[PDB]
Design a protein around this ligand. Structure first.
Ligand code: HEC
Ligand code: HEC
Ligand code: HEC
Ligand SMILES: C[C@H](CCC(=O)O)[C@H]1CC[C@H]2[C@@H]3CC[C@@H]4C[C@H](O)CC[C@]4(C)[C@H]3C[C@H](O)[C@]12C
Length: 71
C-alpha cells in the first residue's frame, strides 16, 4: 500500500510507513488498537502521542513544525 499524507492546512504531513515499520518493531503501538482510532485522530493526537509525542519518547523522529509540515 501507499504512504498517506494528512492534509493539514498549514502544510501536508506525510507519514512514511517503511521508516516506522523499521524503527518501531512494537507494531502494537499503532496496530490492533480497539475501535475509534480512525475517527479519533486529529491535531491534538498528532501533536501528542499520535505523532510528535512518540518521536519525543523514542528520542527519534521529527519534532519541529517544519519537519512534519511541508507545503
Ligand atoms: C504507527 C506509527 C505504525 C507503526 C509503528 C507500524 N505501522 Fe503499519 N501502518 C500504519 C499506518 C498508518 C498504515 C496505513 C498507511 C500507510 O502508510 O501504509 C500502515 C500500514 C501497514 C501495512 C500495509 C502496508 C503495505 O501494504 O504497504 C502493513 C502490512 C503494516 N502496517 C504492518 C505493520 C507492522 C508488521 C509493523 C511493525 C513492525 C507496523 N506496521 C508498524 C501505522 C503503523
Ligand atoms: C511511535 C509509536 C511513532 C508514532 C506513533 C509516529 N512516529 Fe514517526 N517516527 C518514529 C520513529 C522512531 C522515527 C525515526 C525513523 C528513523 O529511522 O529515523 C520516526 C520517523 C518519522 C519521520 C521521518 C522518517 C525518515 O525517513 O526519517 C516522519 C516524517 C514521521 N515519523 C512522521 C510521523 C507522523 C506524521 C506520525 C503521525 C501520523 C508519526 N510519525 C507517528 C516513531 C513514531
Ligand atoms: C509531526 C511529528 C508534527 C509536528 C512536529 C507538528 N505537527 Fe502539526 N500536525 C501534524 C499532523 C499529522 C497534523 C494533522 C492532524 C489531522 O487532523 O490529521 C497536524 C495538524 C496541525 C494543524 C491543524 C491543521 C488542520 O487542521 O488542517 C496545525 C495548525 C499545525 N499542525 C501546526 C503545527 C505547528 C505550528 C507545529 C510546531 C509548533 C506543529 N504543527 C508540529 C504533525 C505534526
Ligand atoms: C493509533 C495510532 C497510535 C496513536 C495512539 O496511541 O492512539 C495512530 C498513529 C498514527 C495514526 C494514523 C495516522 C494516519 C490516519 C489519520 C486519520 O485521521 C485516521 C486514520 C489514520 C490511519 C490514523 C489511525 C491511528 O490513529 C494511528 C495509526
Amino acid at each position: 500500500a501507499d504512504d498517506i499524507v494528512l492534509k493539514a492546512k498549514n502544510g501536508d504531513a506525510k507519514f512514511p510507513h517503511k521508516a516506522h515499520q523499521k524503527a518501531v518493531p512494537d507494531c502494537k503501538k499503532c496496530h490492533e488498537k480497539g475501535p475509534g482510532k480512525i475517527e479519533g485522530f486529529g491535531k491534538e493526537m498528532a501533536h501528542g502521542k499520535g505523532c510528535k509525542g512518540c518521536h519525543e519518547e523514542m528520542k527519534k523522529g521529527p519534532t519541529k513544525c517544519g519537519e512534519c509540515h511541508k507545503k
